[PDB]
Design a protein around this ligand. Structure first.
Ligand SMILES: O=c1ccn([C@@H]2O[C@H](COP(=O)(O)NP(=O)(O)OP(=O)(O)O)[C@@H](O)[C@H]2O)c(=O)[nH]1
Ligand SMILES: [Mg+2]
Ligand SMILES: [Mg+2]
Ligand code: NA
Length: 327
DNA sequence: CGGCATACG
DNA sequence: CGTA
DNA sequence: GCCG
């Protein structure tokens, strides 16, 4: 088992679901406390289990696995022996964990905002609604639409949205393309949002595109919220339903075609996969990776990629299709 | 011990 | 600060 | 919290 998640296939469904979910609770709780390092270790340990070919049934099967030390091993030991880990259950029922989860789930609220509200004594969504002067416009939208945004987006919803995005994109710039990214590209059947990447085959034609797309979607009555030159937009869309509609989060990204493989890789995820890939690039290969390119700081040159396959090859990694990037 | 991804709105 |  |  290699130490980095980008060195091994991780499928969407696997053989250690309950163990990985427990470790991910501890990761989330670490994040709520500001401990990024412990969040990373628990996430990485969880992801190792996702990559295993069969269920862990005995503690000895963790020997030698990366990211399993005394703490993560004890959690697994307790789950194997008793079906429950007391530390995990204590986190689950704690007021701090439940409220931070509730608040950080709001669009426009991160850990630092949630923590401040917690310390001020706020505990419920209605607590926040009763003091709406202290909310950003983004938080107001996240709170108004919170119930709909709490409903999973279905793969059935994605086809309808991609068609309306393509229509607006086609009027804004004929020949521009729309690619589904994020979790759905990795094979997820549901999601918290829909993520799209937009480009044009002629380098430079994509400049100025996203304002033109957003204005057109807004004219069609499809935009319930957006932030407004820009190249990423975090929107709330009106999606039809039988007899009505529901609010759905949609992310749009524009990239020049020269950067498209890097933007596609960076937007396809998973989040942990991308962090691990960027860490691998810099620490093992001495190259700096982001969603625009791959830089050699010794030659001061950028690597021209025509595909995601190119990027894995330039990093000396076996290619992983999106469905195996579910770290 | 230092390090823990990286960029845009 | 928020977002991906 | 764990790795190197
Ligand atoms: O912190 C982050 C968040 C997101 N991303 C990148 O942006 C992509 C979309 O980010 P996302 O927040 O839409 N997550 P996704 O995997 O689509 O699952 P879901 O919760 O169902 O929407 C992710 O898959 C990563 O590639 C990061 O690189 N870092
Ligand atoms: Mg998504
Ligand atoms: Mg998204
Ligand atoms: Na949030």
């Amino acid at each position: 088992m290699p130490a980095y998640a980008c060195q091994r296939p991780t499928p969407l469904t696997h053989h250690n679901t309950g163990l990985s979910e427990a470790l991910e609770i501890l990761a989330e709780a670490a994040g709520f406390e500001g401990s990024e390092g412990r969040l990373l270790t628990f996430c990485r340990a969880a992801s190792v289990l996702k990559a295993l070919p069969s269920p862990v049934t005995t503690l000895s099967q963790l020997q030698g696995l990366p990211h399993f030390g005394e703490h993560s091993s004890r959690v697994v030991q307790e789950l194997l022996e008793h079906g429950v880990c007391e530390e995990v259950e204590r986190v689950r029922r704690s007021e701090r964990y439940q409220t931070m989860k509730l608040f950080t789930q709001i669009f426009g609220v991160g850990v630092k905002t949630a923590d401040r509200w917690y310390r001020e004594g706020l505990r419920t969504l209605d607590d926040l609604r009763e003091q709406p002067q202290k909310l950003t416009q983004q938080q107001k939208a996240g709170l108004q639409h919170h119930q709909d945004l709490s409903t999973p987006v279905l793969r059935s919803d994605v086809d309808a949205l991609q068609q309306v995005v393509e229509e607006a994109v086609g009027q804004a710039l004929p020949g521009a393309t729309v690619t589904l990214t994020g979790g759905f590209r990795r094979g997820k059947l549901q999601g918290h949002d829909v993520d799209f990447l937009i480009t044009h085959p002629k380098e430079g034609q994509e400049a100025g595109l996203l304002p033109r797309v957003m204005c057109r979607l807004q004219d069609q009555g499809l935009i319930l919220y957006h932030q407004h030159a820009f190249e990423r937009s975090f929107c709330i869309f009106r999606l039809p339903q039988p007899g009505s509609w529901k609010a759905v989060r949609v992310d749009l990204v524009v990239a020049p075609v020269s950067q498209f493989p890097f933007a596609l890789l960076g937007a396809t995820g998973s989040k942990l996969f991308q962090r691990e890939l960027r860490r691998f690039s810099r620490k093992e290969k001495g190259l700096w990776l982001n969603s625009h390119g791959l830089f050699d700081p010794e030659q001061k040159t950028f690597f021209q990629a025509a595909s995601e396959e190119d990027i894995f090859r330039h990093l000396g990694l076996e290619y992983l299709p999106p469905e195996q990037r579910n770290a």
